[PDB]
């Protein structure tokens, strides 16, 4: 052997359960000799697979002692230093995917976060966040959800996380360092944003203006843009007041991928208060009248689909006076 001596749990006890997590800390080489310890690799694979089918299918098996055992295990496998266009994939996915799966334990009905709070602390949550720079998408996918759960269950870390994400975006926009998991992080925020309490704390108001808007200006914007748009329209929905510098910001940061802008805008228009619309109708339309002409074809068509919007066409009706002359006659 090379990881002790165990087997499926018919026996029923938890001590066995402990030992499996514990020999599942035995790490393997999937990189610098993929062909090593294939029999052992499969064992570890099966064990994780076992533990998963276990924790989902049979209640009151999560229990005070195992919390640190589970965390410790997730710790020992996931927290590692990462390698560096088309992506690199985690050679070790065959293990690491199940460690991802298994840890979602987070979602088991009898997860008591009160016991967990002991082990799923800031030191952890950090190195979790550190892993968002993974080139491998299907890993990021896992982290996105995982970290989501942790936020929604540990009120205790809600604070800390927010700061840490801030400090990523800030370093990303300003400190110029590329940070590689921005579309996932951004999808998180959308749901943190949706849930924001009223009135918007001026801090949130500021993060909009100092972090969320500058993202539009970056070169890779297309790569994370859908999710960026959501955060924006989620703001403009929580407080209808921020429309004024939001739309302006957008028109400044405007160009091709004109289309994405065209999406965000309609999605913005969909939520716009009439009194707030007037604030920007003039500059907005000058811009839009350009797009209907925009030689880039699919730009124009997209600009056209605005006129099919019943609300948008009401807003124009209400103001056809000032808007309509922004076409010819």
């Amino acid at each position: 052997v090379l990881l002790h001596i165990r087997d499926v749990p018919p026996a029923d006890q938890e001590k066995l359960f402990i030992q499996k997590l514990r020999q599942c800390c035995v790490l393997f080489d999937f990189v610098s000799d993929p062909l090593s310890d294939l029999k052992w690799k499969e064992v570890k694979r099966a064990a994780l697979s076992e533990m998963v089918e276990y924790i989902t299918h049979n209640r009151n098996v999560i229990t005070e002692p195992i919390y640190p055992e589970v965390v410790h295990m997730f710790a020992v496998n996931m927290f590692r230093t990462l390698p560096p266009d088309e992506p690199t994939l985690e050679a070790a996915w065959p293990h690491l995917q199940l460690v991802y799966e298994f840890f979602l334990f987070l979602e088991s009905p009898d997860f008591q976060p009160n016991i967990a709070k002991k082990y799923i602390d800031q030191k952890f949550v950090l190195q979790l966040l550190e892993l968002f720079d993974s080139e491998d998408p299907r890993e990021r996918d896992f982290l996105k959800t995982t970290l989501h759960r942790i936020y929604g269950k540990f009120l205790g870390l809600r604070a800390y996380i927010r700061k840490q994400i801030n400090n990523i975006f800030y370093r990303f926009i300003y400190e110029t360092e590329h940070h590689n998991g921005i579309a996932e992080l951004l999808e998180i925020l959308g749901s943190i944003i949706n849930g924001f309490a009223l009135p918007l704390k001026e801090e949130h108001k500021i993060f909009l203006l100092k972090v969320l808007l500058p993202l539009h200006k970056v070169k890779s914007l297309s790569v994370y843009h859908p999710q960026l748009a959501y955060c924006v329209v989620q703001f403009l929905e929580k407080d209808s007041t921020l429309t004024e510098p939001v739309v302006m910001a957008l028109l400044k940061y405007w160009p091709p991928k004109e289309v994405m802008f065209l999406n965000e805008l309609e999605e913005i228009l969909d939520v716009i208060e009439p009194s707030e619309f007037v604030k920007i109708m003039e500059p907005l339309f000058r811009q839009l009248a350009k797009c209907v002409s925009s030689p880039h074809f699919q730009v124009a068509e997209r600009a056209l689909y605005y006129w099919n919007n019943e609300y948008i066409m009401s807003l124009i009706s209400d103001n056809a006076a000032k808007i309509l002359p922004i076409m010819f006659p």
Partner: peptide, 7 residues
């Protein structure tokens, strides 16, 4: 498909 969090 990600659930909103009562922040």
């Amino acid at each position: 498909r990600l659930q909103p969090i009562p922040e």
